[PDB]
Structure formats: structure tokens, C-alpha cells
Symmetry: D2
């Protein structure tokens, strides 16, 4: 009927427009209550039980805050109530496409299960949004509140995934370009999605968040840069932006790429792979889908959530025994053992095509220690992690426009040397974790010897614990001594 | 083997003894990751996604804090490392018995589904603890860390459920105070409450007024009637009254939220309609229903909030009735709130009369033009007992205190000795009425029946009475 | 000029209109940086170092929030930018009149020092506001931003102190009545001043605040009640309002009336009394004022802050030796010793005129025990504390109007039985603390005997520690056994 | 033995040993209630009203936490109750020496006022501690609780200031070396003083703190490194340590070196300099001291707090008119105007002795543009700020010892390459702020031209707003285009 107030622990009392309420009260959206924001992280950080549902409300709310604040400071932008609603909707709905365990699904599982396809949760969101609209008679309700469904549905989808291919967008013209920089910012990565998860994940994880989004909003203006209207930050605030990405990096290093969290994700992925053939999910017209193919039909995908984990865990079907056994090993905490961590040196970069060949390389190393057990390629997992500021090797701050107190409509650029000598020199790196599937004390000892040898052989960094875990191997490498 | 560190958002970095790690890393305990602390509340408070698992770690940690602090202030108590471990274990394990959606399971579902049994999550915890111990070879590991399994397993169980003349056999009278930590039957002041106040507030987005750390610093053990009891400092009496006021606030704002409760009611109804067709494998391959898994711990292990999604995602036409109710939850087609009232004077509605109340509302005769006529089954009447944890009694009368000038001398404090601004009564009842018929005309009619029923039973005027039923409220002179 | 942004720990980033900046950047306002919010409380709660300055910004900000939210929900109220500014100004400025150590000055010191006058910090605020306006050329600046100084200065003053004398206000007409319910609510005590201090004092004290003002604002509406437009709360929210006053009461019982905090306030007051003759403060035209008379000249009052404490403490003048000695006893923590606490029973009420006669009564009690020392009236302090819900014996919730979801413009009333049986029966009480100026073990023992006897004699409540501190006295009273 | 409980907003309920209570309840310690932690910062961050008093309790408490935790994990260290008390006392007392406005006094005022002396607040603390002990009969009370005053007073002083000149300490032997790494860590800068201020300043400022000290403590162990027992961190925690110093840097950049906060500190310092001749503070035997000389007599220093600001501000003495006028300009917010900010490039490092010559350099620049006014050296302030990780150009993490999960008693080292490529390359930098004493629009315009020219001339970084504030000057420098 009218506006709903929702009490969120992060944002406090949030107003929801009745149109958003209608979008929210659908199985496509409610689905998000059953997908953990951080997947395997919950198995390391016991506070991190939060789901995509609450994150989505926060992204929607923040999207609305930014656009509304821009509108109030700059009425010359001609931001309408219609524009605000579409930005809120895009904010709510950009998480619709997440599969079970969020980033494990599109980052680990689908690449292994369906190598030939290229899938992202963003594509999923678009498809799921379409399904949500059509299955719930949303278009009449959009019209009722002054939206024009054809243009606006397009606008929403473009905000989530980018150009559906000179001005490449068809939902809004160039004079509203800045509206595409709110929910998902392809230019520099500063968007409201990040802002909600920094705050939300920190609150649940028990880490403290150093970024203040409210301050960013108060200092945000729209200015012309190269004949486009873009969201600009106040020049003074440049330090806070570098801090925002440092914060992003901290969350990744401490929580999202936690070495045990990642191994749990790997084990859950492995169980899904072994379960994939025997789990069936009913989609459109009674047709059946696998976990790995539910991404092709939105009706099936609706019913694809973290419940899959428990479906496997509680199953009696002997065909699911292999999948079920892996998950039971998670419950007993018989996890694959962390062997160590290393990095490439200088400009050495490990390509995506070489990932499969790395367990073989570790097993082929010839450490000079007496070993009771001999280990093979399949006993090792090598997890290559790309740690960056969101834009590969590029500095995202070079893609931010700024303004000064004295000329608020004049956009400017700020280079890294203009800010601080204490900032990072590089903006992308790689971490290599090694784990061993053999969990006894003797195998783990052996694994450590192979690993440290492989590091020496590839001229990678000395593992931090190198002298402790492999005292007979580390002296051969002069660079480490 | 040394300590594992867990980072909890409420308590920060918590150390876990390797024995507790072993108890935690079992399917019986890990199960608790899949049971929401506040069940249906998550459908009202979007922050309230937290599970019993994390609550359990917190209860364990706090239990350890209290016993350890008592030990350090009073070494004459002779609290051993053994005693601390058993109190921590009891703290961890007192939530083992919770079913799907926590309090809805033992408070709504089992009473309706299995009226002949008397079941509490506490009994469940004892049974589940036994199963956890036996299924995971914990006894050898208890011995390894200096526990004596026979005495100590008993001690742990007694802390969770109470006594199975000094009624306890896990510890003697000289250690009586150890039974006042995890679950305090005497006055309700225990560590389980302290963790949930803090945890639920952090997730719900309300702020918690109670400071447990301050209570611990002012806690002492003193002799009262030949028993050693945990006493509070006399000055702190105001904070204790505040602690129960806080408990009451959490209940009124969150745990008994009118929509949260209706969602709990709907989920319970779906479980009832699903109970015949969901099967859970227990011991030796035997099959159990949702309502009977409480009789076999192996089945109960696999009984979590996943039941909700099992029903919701099912295709079996036998589950259509249950599935339809849950789909109505997703679409937010909920039973509509009609209004709320209370009994007056000493009037107390007994548990046996709950069933007869929808009939009473439908039988009321409001003197107005009604487009629809409504029947008993169209109404839900939810009776809620709001109290300070001890029925009509004041829990502060069951707290012993001490003074700065005589720290070993226990005393009592009466309510007039504290404040005239305190509550006169310590128990009350709320009656919510809802309508299963959701259209505008039915809701209008429902409100007329309801306000009439209030007048007829001499209950309190509903707050919105003049707005929802302007033609009914003038008949009652006491209301104006 | 545009807005200045202030980062407050309680409210986050606050915007200040350039007019408010001008009012703030004056010695009359800046003065408030040197007056502690909680006076003597800082000597008990080490976090409570905050000053009236920051509290004032918060009251101003919140005043603006409430009026602005009302305006946005109900444009039919015709709240202008002019109205918002005046409410913000009244919010900023309602603390201008506070003397050194806030409530101790108007609550303890002036009543003792100048019994014939009736002074309140609110009157002080009006006078100080007038002085601020005139001394800083504010009127031209008010005109610049669309205010009409004659009407508006009046409006501001009326918000702070009430009618300067049928509609009794002359700053605004009946159709804007609700604007008088924001900064200082004479009707029920629900105002923004309280809201800032609950939040601010809790944050500094290390108590946690259970009241959510943001939620109140979202549920606040203006409705007609008895031909007046009043701020109404949503019916559901009634529980939270009772809780708001319970919270107020908790803050008083734990912090503002802490037994040691109050004795420190008593000692500081006593030092000020002994110093009052010899401290001189320059006012208008070089004229000299005492601490107790600076309230008569705003120029002197400007220079009257917590610095008075340190002026006395650091003085060398032998005439200030008496005052200086008391303050040195505070530093050494040689405080008057707490003897005990009691309350009147039934309808017994101790009147303000009888406070002086109470130490005599305690000393005149006849305990019938062996006493090494005999104590006199001047050895005892009796502190009478009025604890209420803000409106004497009355329930403030009976003076709150409500509305329902189904009829948002229709005001209603809610009686106490309509809410809960667990609520307080009485809404005012008195606490009596007794202290002894003699600090040795024997005097303290004797003092406790006199005190417990006096309780018995006056038929007051049994002191909590009665059986411990006076085991020979408590058995005579059958009501206590 | 009764412990006293203090409720701190940061740490919650803190127990104080009766000996610490005795040290606290003295004028030498209580003095700290009247010195603001962040001096001038309060004039920018209105929450930052907190004083050194509360900070000191926190440092004491944390010192006790660390030593106590080390004792419980490693009883082989033989940490006694005596050792814990001395570490707590050192923690309490390391802030005793702070003057009015904390770091402004030792960082700005004394260097200008007394160039011939080398004074630090740490030396002040030692002297003040000595005075506190002797003036309050603390030595007998130390003996009562098992301390041996001669050895232990030495130990406490050494913890605060370092060696009072092969093992350089005489309070404790090499086997207790780690006890010197708690209150003030000269080796790497990881100490409990930092931990309390990160938490405390953030809580008051309204910034959020990303460092978790409790986690550091749980991962801290004592291990042998080069025949010394040192506090070691877990190898995994190395990232958190880099983050700790990044956090320190953030606090400095956002708050402690805020451009307005620093100008207020400069103005207060200037007023103190002009007041120094005419303010008298009574010390030992009735002798009189100036603000700049009270550091030579502890009895005078006791009475030297932020009250000096208000003494000057409220004075009528015409000799204080110059000092009083500057402070009145603070109240009216007629502050020296920020012109801009720059940094040195390459290896250029501006020495402390050259600070005085910089305003001359700026005024001597020849921008050659239409200028209504000509500005002189005395019209400019140049503030040089050293931003570092606590150890000049060195990486503090190279001076941290670590241990591994697999060998907890074996200390190791970790190089920067072994951690992350995303870390800083340099660990020290300089910021140069320029301000103008002339506040009109025309002078400010001129000042900006001189400034940007001076940047070009010295080959410093382009000011961020350079193209806006000086569009005719920035094109001459090719490196900036
Ligand atoms: N007292 C409270 N304090 C904090 N949050 C609350 C409180 N009551 C409810 N909430 C939460 C639960 C929801 O997230 C949100 C709205 O709940 P509430 O205002 O009770 O809505 P409702 O939908 O039951 O009221 P309405 O009767 O207007 O429909 O705030
Ligand atoms: N940097 C961090 N800050 C806060 N919490 C963290 C951080 N890293 C991990 N945690 C959380 C996750 C866990 O609940 C808890 C323990 O994690 P961590 O110390 O990484 O254990 P671990 O078992 O992986 O390490 P170990 O190698 O010592 O076994 O702390
Ligand atoms: N990085 C930060 N994070 C949080 N609060 C900050 C930060 N920097 C400054 N503050 C606080 C201090 C002030 O109270 C408020 C505004 O400061 P700031 O924006 O630096 O104002 P200013 O007047 O110095 O800037 P300008 O006039 O250049 O816009 O924010
Ligand atoms: N209810 C409360 N909650 C939180 N902090 C409190 C409360 N009451 C007092 N405090 C604070 C103020 C002090 O910092 C600290 C100690 O207070 P309190 O225990 O009242 O000391 P006290 O010394 O007056 O008691 P006594 O001498 O009677 O033991 O805690
Ligand atoms: Mg581990
Ligand atoms: Mg400014
Ligand atoms: Na362990
Ligand atoms: Na309980
Ligand atoms: Na009252």
C-alpha cells in the first residue's frame, strides 16, 4: 500500500517505497535470504551468518541516498523521482544472480563444472530480474508509480551489467551518465555495493571498518569530464579514497581469502562437483536441471540456494556418498591441510591457463630429505589468488575525478605523487597457497618439503615459516640467506 | 595441543580449550549453524540472521569468564581447572537441543504436534550431549585433560537441566554456586541471557542497556542458608531490576513482535501439514517425522531450518498444503493483524482455554452492517505471557546481596527498599487477534468482532479502538 | 557562503547553515567549550569530559532533523526554510545560559548564594542569546538569510523559555504550534535536547543507550488536538516512550545523581561559596562582579566557566585559602564519607525549605549505643534528590498524543492500563543521602548509628545495608523485621 | 586489599590496585584532567574533548593486560605480581609530563620559547613521577605491596624514557627484557600507549579504528632473539602490523595534523609566546615561573594546564592584550587562511633548522601576474609535517620478531617481499602547508600565486587544486602537464 520502514543493524531505519516492497516480496528476491554473503567464511568467522537478502536492502538504500543527495545539492541535474526509483531498484536487484555460497559459485564451481561457458553473477542478476518482473506482474506496478517499463527495465539492467552491446547506453541519455556510476561503477569501482558490504561484513566478522561512506556522499558532486557528467569527489578526500581501497584489500586478505575459508570453499565446490550428476532441480515446464545447469533456467535457479549443501549432507542416496563424505569431513574439521604460501618475484605472473599444471609441478620437485611417504599431483591443491585494487594492475584513483572548494563545477585529476609517498607502488599481486589432501602428520611433513623445494625451484618468495617447516631445504637457496 | 582463537563480533577474540574444540567439531554441535536464533524474527528484523552456533560459543565463553573471575577473587572456593572446563562445556552445550527455528519448535510446534509429551529444548540438550559424547569418543579426550567422565558428564547435564537435602550429584554443597552460572533456576540471572541480550541486540539493531561485565566485577560467593551462592553488591540492585526490564524490552520489541509471531504461527502450521510426508533417517536406518525426531538423536541431528526449504522447494503433491503456506510467506500474504488487548484486574487466561478463543471472537455480536460473516477458523488468537522470568514472582527477592563493609555477609533487599518507580506486578498477558481472511471487507468485519469481544470480556480498549471501530467503542462507558 | 560540515561522534557529519556558523563563532557561544556537560560526574566517570558546546551542536542538528522530517511528510504544515532556521537556532542556543559545571550552578550554587532570586539556566540562555545577537551584528545576517529579526528573535526566545507572558505566543501563530514542541517541550518533556544528551552522555559515560530517536522521528506526525497542531507519535510506539523516560531515570540514578558525583558537586559548591567574596569578574564598562552576581551581567557571565575551579585551585591569595583547601581535598580524594541512603514512605514529602533543618535532625537522634565520639549538625550533609519522569507526580505519557496506521491525521490518547501492567505505579520519588564530614573510622561508625536511628524515627525505608552498618539499631523497628 | 573499579568508555570496567589508586589521587596525576589529549583538534573535531587523565588510565590498564597475558601463557618467564604493578605504574605515569594542549607544548611551544633546551614530555613524566612519589609518601605504600622502591622506581622511569645512559637497563635484568617492550617500545614502536589512543581518539573524533589490540595480545609470545627475551608476533599477523602503522598514519593525516587543527595550535602557541613574559606560576618555596620555565620546577608544572588559555583569554591586564587578541581571533574564527599543501620530491628532506627561512622563500617568489597586494615573509606561515611509521625512514616491521604455529618458541624474521607487493615503498614523507595571516579575498588570491610559484621553483609536487587556485602559474611547469 504505502511506505515500509525496515530496521537494518547497519543503516538503522530505512524507508522502502511500495514499488520496492513489491519487488522484494517475490520468491526471486526472497531467495536471497538463503544465500550466505561470505559462503565458506562463516565456517571461519562465526559472526558471518548474514545473507545476500539484507545486503541487497542495504545496497538499495544506499543507492537511493547517493542519488537523492546529488539531486538535492544540484537540482540542475534534473534527477526525477522516477530516476531515484530506478537506481534503488538496480541497487536492490544487483545481487539477484548470486548462486549458493555467493562468490564460490561463480568463482570456483561454474568454472570447474562448465568450463566452456562464461558466467558471472551479474549476468544472473539480469536474467533473474527479467524473471522476477515477468512472474510477478511488476510492469503494471511500475507504471502506477510513474515508471516507463520499456526504457526503465533497460536502465535497471544496464546499471547491473553495463552496456547491452559514441554513447553506449539506451536506458538514459548522456546528460544522466552519472546515474550509471552508482550501483556498479565500471570506471573506478567506487559504488554503493562496496559501501554496504564493507559496513555489513565488518559488523558481522568482528573487524572494524575504517571507511565512512556518509562523508563521501556529503563531498560528492556531479561535474562535466570529457563531455560526460560524472560523480566527483572533493580534492581533500583523495586520501580517504586510497584508504577505501586499502580497506577493500584488508577485507579480502583477512576474510574473503582466508586460507581456511578458501579451503572450505574448495571442499564444498568439490562436493558439488561429485553431487552434480545426481541432484535434480525442477525448472520451467517440469524440466530437470543439474546444479551446474540451473543457471540456464531462472525457475530452477530460484530454488538453488545454500540448501543444496544440506540436501547433500542429509541425503541417503548411495550415489551421493562421495559428495556427502566430503561434507561430513567439513563437520569433523578434517580439512585439507595448509602447507604454505608464496608469491612470484619481480614481474613474474602466473597465467590462468597454467593453474591446472601446478599441483604436478609441486609433486615433481625433488627435495633432499628422507621421506617415508611419496606424494602425487592429486594430493596437492594450488590456489592462485589475484589480489588487486579492483582494476587489474591499474590505480583506480587515476580514474576518479575531483573538484576544489574554489571551483565546484570544475573537474580535475590527481596523480599518486600528488598525494603521498606512503602509498602502494603496485596495485596487483598474486598469492599462491598450497594445501595437502593427505591429512596425517607424516604426509603433511612430506608436503612441506615438496612445497618449499618447489618455491626454491621456481624462484618464488621464501615462505614465512620456511626455516621452521623445512630447515633442510631453505639453506640451498642463497637469495634466502 | 594448545588453544584455538575464535573471533566473535560480540565478545571479540575467544580462546577455546582443545577439549571444547573436539566437542564443537562434531555434527551434533555443527548442526547449530543451521538453526536461526530468533526463527521468524529474521522475517521482521533483517539483521537477525544469526544462528544458535555462535550463541553457544558465546554462552561457553561467558560461563568461563564468570567461573574464572569468581575463582580469582575467592581462591578459598577451590575452583579447579577441571571445574572451569565443565562449566564451559555446560555453557557450550545448553543449546544443543534446539529444534528448527529455536523457540517456535519447543514453544509452538511440539505442543500442537505431540500434546501427550512434555518437551523442552533443555531435555533435548541433555540427550544430544549424551549422543555427542558417545558418537565421537569424547570420554577418552575428557580423561586426557583431567576430567573424570562419570562425575563430570553428570555435572554438565545437571547444569543444563537441573536436578535429576542436596539434590545434585555432579558436585557437593561446597560448590553450589557452580549451578548458578549456565542456567540459574533460582532467579534467572545466568550467562545464557547475557550472551543473547548482547547478540540479539547487535543483529536486531536495538541497543542493549545491560552491562554483564559490571555484574561479574561485583559478583561474590557468600553463604546463604548453608549454601554457597553468587551474590551481587547491594548498590547494584537497580541494575538487576534494569536487567529484567531489558529482558522485557527485547521480548516486547523483538521476540513477540506481532508480525514475527504470525510468521512463526504460519511456519508452525506448514510444519504440521508437512509432518506426515517429510522423513528423517535415524539410528539403524529407521525413519522419523519432524514431530518424532525428538525421540531419536541421530534423526534430530539432521533436523534444522533446512526443513523450511525442503518443504518450500518440494514437488510432491502431498506437500502442496505445507508448500502453499510457505509460498504465502514469500509473497507476504500474511494473516492480518486485527488488534491487541489485555485482561483487567486479576483475570488470567489458562493454557487450556487458548483453543476456545477464536470461537469466542466469532460469536461476538457487533451491532453494525457487515458485508461478510466470519467463523472461528478465520481468527487466530495469540496469548503471550510477559513476565520477569519467574511467573508472578519478583526475581530480585531471590537474589542475595552483600555490602562494601561486610563482603562475606549476605543480605536481602525488598522492593520498597529500592524505588517506588519500579513495576508493581511482574507478569501480564497480551492477546493478539489476527484474521486469516486478507481482503479489505473481511479485515473491517474482523475488527468489529474483535472490539466487541473486548467490550464483552471487559478487556482493555484496543489503542486504535476509536479509529478501527468508531461505532462500537461508545457502548462501553469505561472507555469514554 | 554555503554549508560547513562538522564531524560529531554521536551524529556523524552535520551540516551547518552559514547563519548558524555566525552564531557559533562568537565568545558567547564558544564559551560553552569550557563548561562540562556533567560537572562533577567527570570526577566519577572518567569518560564524561564532554562540554556543553558539542551538546549544543547536537541539539541544533536534531532540532533541524525533526522539523525538516515533519516538513517533508506534511507539506500542508507550510514549514518554511525560515522556520527551520529558527528552530535550529533555538536548539543551538538553549544551552547558552549554563554556568560552570552545568546543573550544579543553577541547581546547587545560586540557590545557596542568592536565595532571594529565582534563576534558571533557561532565563540565562535568553539573556545570553540577546547579548550574542547585539554584540555580534547578527540581525543584518538574519535578514540576509530571510529571517525577520523582530518576530524571529522572539520566536527563538519563546522556544527556549516558553511564553514571555488564549494563544500565549507571539513569535508564531496557532497554526505553527508544533514548532514550540521541538527544542523544549513544556507539555510532555519529549524534545530534542533530551535526545542528544541520552546519546552523548551514554557514549562518554560507557553506559549504553536504549532509546532510538531516529525511530521516533520516522513515526512522528503533526495532528490537530483541541484546535492546536501537535507532534504526535504512532500508537505502537507508546512502549518506546515509556522506555525513553525509564532511560532518563537510569541516567539520573547511575550517573547524574551518583552518590560520589553529588558529594563532589556539594564540595565544589561549598568552595565556590567560600570563594564568592574574593573572585572578581569584569563585566560591562569595567564593572566587577562576583561568581554569584555574574548572572546579572552577560558580559561577565561570558567569562564565567569551569575555569573558576582552577582559578581557585591555583590561587595564592590567602583570602581564598578556605575555598582552595576544599578543592585540594577533592584532588586527594578526602571526600565526605557516604553514610547511607533512605526514602520517605507513603505520601511523606520533604519540602525545599526544610533541607537546612535535616542535618540537625540526624544529630538529634538518640541511638542508645556506646559511642566513642558525639557528632553535631555541621558534621552531617543531607542531600535530597527528586527523581521523577519530568513532570512532578504526573505521567508524561498522558500528555502525549498518538495516531494509528489506519487514520494518520486522527489524534488519540492512550492510558497506562492500555499499555502494560509492568509499568511504574508512581512517577516521582525522593532519595535522601546522608554523608559525614568526619572521615575517621570511629566518626563514621557513630554517623551510621545516628543515621539508621533517624530513619527509624522518621519512619523512612530501611537502609539496604542497615543490618550490617547498625546491627544494634535495626531490631527496634518491627516493620523492618 | 580492595580493588577500585573505574568505568571507562573504551575499556569498560577496569580494576585499579590500591597502590595505583594512591598514585592517581594526587595533584600531579589529577592535573591530567585539565590537559586535552589532542589540543587544537577539539577546535575542529567537537567530540575530541577528552583529556590525558582518561588516556593514562587506559595505558595503565592495557599495560597490565599485556604483561598479565604473557604471564599466563608463559609461566617460565617468572613474571611476579611485583612486575605487573611496575608495568601498570609505568603505563599510568608515562603521560604525567604533558603540558597544556599535549603535543603542541612539546612540539611547537618549547622549541620556539626555549631553543637552547631539549625537552620531551617523556623527560617531564620522569621528573613529575619523582615529584609525585616524594610529595605523597608513596615509597612506604610501594613497600607495603611488595615493591622495592629503589630498584622499582628506576624500572618505572626506564620504561617511560629508556636507558638512563651490553645490557643498558638497571631496573630489571636481561631475562626480563620483554618488560621494556610494553609501555614504550623503542625497538619497533609497538606499545600499549598507541593502542589506547587509537581506540580513544577514534571514539571521540568519530572515526572508526581498524586496529584490534586484543587480537595482537592473543597472538603475542615471548621468544629468545639474540640472547634477549622479546615479545614476538605470530607470523600470520604480519599483515595486521603493517595495518597498525597504516592506521597510525591515517589518524595523523585526518586528525592530528588536520590543516585547521594545526593552524589553531600555531595561533595558541603564538599567544603563549606573547603571554610568556606576563603570566606567573608559583612553584617551590614561593618562587615564580613563566609558562616556558615551569618545566624546570615540578611544583609549578603541576599548575600548568589548559587553564592557561582561559587565564589569557579572560585577563584584563593590558600587557596581555597581544596574547588575548590572538585568542579572541580564535573565538571569532578569524584564523590564518589555508593557502595550499605540497611535498618534497625525490630525496629532498627539510631539516628542523630551515623551518624559519621558509616564509621568506614563499614571499621572494616572483609569480609575475596582476596582484592588487604585495605580501611579505611575516604574512606567511609554513608548517612542515613529518609523516612516518615511527622510525624515521626505516620499516618498523623489520624490527619485529615472529614465530610459527609449528615452532612457537623459535623466533624468525620476515622481509617486505615476503609479505605483499601492495605495501608502501617508503616509510617517511613530508607535508608542507602554507597559510596566510592576511584574511581578505585579495591577499588570499595573491598568497596562492606566490605559493604555487614557490612550488614550481623548489620542484615540489603540484598542489592538488593548483589549476583552480593559480591557472596562470601551473602551465609554466612542464612536469605538471
Ligand atoms: N521497537 C522497535 N525498535 C527497533 N526496531 C523495531 C521496533 N519495532 C519494530 N522494529 C523493526 C522491525 C522492522 O524491521 C521495522 C518495522 O517494524 P514495525 O514498525 O513494528 O512495523 P510493522 O510492520 O509491525 O508496523 P505497522 O503496524 O506499521 O505495519 O523495525
Ligand atoms: N585479521 C583478522 N582480524 C580479525 N579476525 C580474524 C583475522 N584473521 C582471522 N580472523 C578470525 C577468524 C577466526 O574466527 C579467528 C582465528 O582465525 P586465524 O587466527 O586466521 O586462525 P587459523 O586457524 O587459520 O590460524 P592458525 O594457522 O593459527 O591455525 O580469527
Ligand atoms: N577524513 C576524515 N574522516 C572523518 N572526519 C573528518 C575527516 N577529515 C576531517 N574530518 C572532520 C573534522 C571536521 O569536524 C569535519 C570537516 O572537516 P574538513 O572537511 O577537513 O573541513 P575543513 O573546513 O577543514 O575543509 P574545507 O574548508 O577545506 O572544506 O570533518
Ligand atoms: N550502573 C552503572 N553502570 C556503569 N558504570 C557505573 C554505574 N554506576 C557507577 N558506574 C561507574 C562510575 C565509576 O567509573 C565506576 C565505579 O562506580 P561505583 O561502583 O558507583 O563506585 P563507588 O566507588 O562509588 O562505589 P563504592 O565505594 O560504594 O564501592 O563505575
Ligand atoms: Mg587453526
Ligand atoms: Mg571549511
Ligand atoms: Na586447539
Ligand atoms: Na535463559
Ligand atoms: Na513526572
Amino acid at each position: 500500500d504505502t511506505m515500509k520502514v525496515i530496521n537494518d543493524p547497519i543503516h538503522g531505519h530505512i524507508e522502502l517505497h511500495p514499488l520496492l516492497v513489491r519487488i522484494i516480496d517475490t520468491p526471486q528476491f526472497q531467495r536471497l535470504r538463503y544465500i550466505k554473503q561470505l559462503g565458506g567464511g562463516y565456517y571461519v568467522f562465526p559472526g558471518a551468518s548474514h545473507n545476500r537478502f539484507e545486503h541487497s536492502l542495504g545496497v538499495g538504500y544506499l543507492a537511493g541516498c547517493l542519488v537523492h543527495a546529488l539531486g538535492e545539492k544540484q537540482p540542475e541535474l534534473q534527477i526525477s523521482e522516477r530516476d531515484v526509483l530506478c537506481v534503488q531498484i538496480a541497487g536492490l536487484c544487483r545481487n539477484l544472480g548470486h548462486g549458493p555460497f555467493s562468490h564460490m559459485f561463480d568463482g570456483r564451481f561454474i568454472p570447474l563444472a562448465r568450463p566452456e561457458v562464461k558466467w558471472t553473477h551479474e549476468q544472473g542478476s539480469v536474467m533473474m530480474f527479467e524473471h522476477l518482473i515477468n512472474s510477478n506482474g511488476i510492469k503494471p506496478v511500475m507504471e502506477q508509480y510513474g515508471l516507463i517499463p520499456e526504457e526503465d527495465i533497460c536502465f535497471i539492467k544496464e546499471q547491473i551489467v553495463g552496456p547491452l552491446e559514441l554513447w553506449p547506453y539506451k536506458g538514459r541519455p548522456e546528460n544522466k551518465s552519472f546515474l550509471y556510476e552508482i550501483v556498479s561503477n565500471k570506471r573506478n569501482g567506487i559504488d554503493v555495493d562496496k559501501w554496504d558490504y564493507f559496513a555489513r561484513d565488518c559488523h558481522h566478522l568482528g573487524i572494524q571498518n575504517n571507511f565512512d561512506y556518509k562523508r563521501f556522499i556529503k563531498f560528492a558532486r556531479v561535474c562535466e569530464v570529457d563531455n560526460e557528467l560524472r560523480i566527483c569527489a572533493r580534492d581533500k578526500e583523495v586520501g580517504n579514497l586510497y584508504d577505501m581501497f586499502h580497506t577493500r584489500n584488508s577485507l579480502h586478505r583477512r576474510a574473503y581469502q582466508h586460507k581456511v575459508g578458501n579451503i572450505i570453499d574448495t571442499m564444498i565446490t568439490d562436493a558439488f562437483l561429485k553431487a552434480d550428476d545426481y541432484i535434480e532441480i525442477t525448472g520451467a515446464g517440469g524440466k530437470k536441471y543439474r546444479i551446474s545447469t540451473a543457471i540456464d533456467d531462472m525457475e530452477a535457479y530460484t530454488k538453488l540456494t545454500d540448501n543444496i549443501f544440506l540436501e547433500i549432507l542429509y541425503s541417503t542416496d548411495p550415489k551421493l556418498k562421495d559428495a556427502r563424505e566430503i561434507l561430513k569431513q567439513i563437520e569433523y574439521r578434517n580439512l585439507f591441510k595448509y602447507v604454505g604460501e608464496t608469491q612470484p618475484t619481480g614481474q613474474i605472473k602466473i597465467k590462468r591457463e597454467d593453474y591446472e599444471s601446478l599441483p604436478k609441478e609441486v609433486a615433481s620437485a625433488k627435495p633432499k630429505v628422507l621421506l617415508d611417504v611419496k606424494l602425487k599431483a592429486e594430493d596437492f591443491i594450488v590456489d592462485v589468488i589475484n589480489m588487486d585494487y579492483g582494476m587489474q594492475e591499474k590505480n583506480p584513483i587515476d580514474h576518479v575525478s575531483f573538484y576544489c572548494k574554489t571551483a565546484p563545477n570544475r573537474a580535475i585529476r590527481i596523480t599518486k605523487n600528488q598525494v603521498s609517498q606512503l602509498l602502494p607502488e603496485k596495485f596487483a599481486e598474486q598469492l599462491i597457497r598450497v594445501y595437502c589432501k593427505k591429512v596425517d602428520r607424516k604426509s603433511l611433513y612430506a608436503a612441506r618439503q615438496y612445497f618449499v623445494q618447489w618455491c626454491a625451484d621456481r624462484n618464488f618468495t621464501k615462505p614465512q615459516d620456511g626455516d621452521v617447516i623445512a630447515p633442510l631445504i631453505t639453506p640451498q637457496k642463497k637469495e634466502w640467506n
